[model samples]
Target: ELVLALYDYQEKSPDEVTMKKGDILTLLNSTNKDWWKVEVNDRQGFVPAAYVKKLD
Candidate 1:
């Protein structure tokens, strides 16, 4: 997963960064469930799992 880091708490959805399949995203424990605070590429933010799809 990819993410554009939130500059501040005021940002609900930060910027836009591209994420490819097989990428690893690290979720922050402080972040709420259902919301994954991930680091993809050099950026990081929250992404709903609904946005993710498996290759199958």
Candidate 2:
């Protein structure tokens, strides 16, 4: 699914990628139970689902 970054999010290190406010991302899968594997900028990374909205 498609989602947009609600705020700036950083990764602890794809290891990962960051998304800026309003950035578009693809909801890939999941790490454990939450957070999300999102594809953006030709890169795949994890960001908390709270910081992103599926509405976009």
Give the best candidate by TM-score: 2
- Kindly state the number of residue pairs that clash in model 2: 0
Q: Write the per-residue lDDT of candidate 2 for residues 1-56, one digit (tens) a residue.
A: 89889999878775567889999899887554668889988989778878888864
Q: What lDDT is obtained when candidate 2 is compared to the true structure?
A: 0.82
Worst 10 residues of 1 by lDDT: 2-11
Question: Which ranges in model 1 have alpha carbons more than 4 Å from their true place?
Answer: 1-12, 15-18, 50-56
- Clashing pairs for model 1 are none
TM-score of 2: 0.79
Per-residue lDDT tens digits for candidate 1, residues 1-56, read 23333332222456433455556545443255555555565776656544443222
- At residue 46, candidate 2 shows an lDDT of 78
Q: What is the TM-score of each candidate against the true structure?
A: 0.44, 0.79
State residue 12's C-alpha deviation in candidate 2, in Å. 1.4
Clash number by candidate, in order? 0, 0
Model 2 Cα shift for residue 39 (angstroms): 0.6
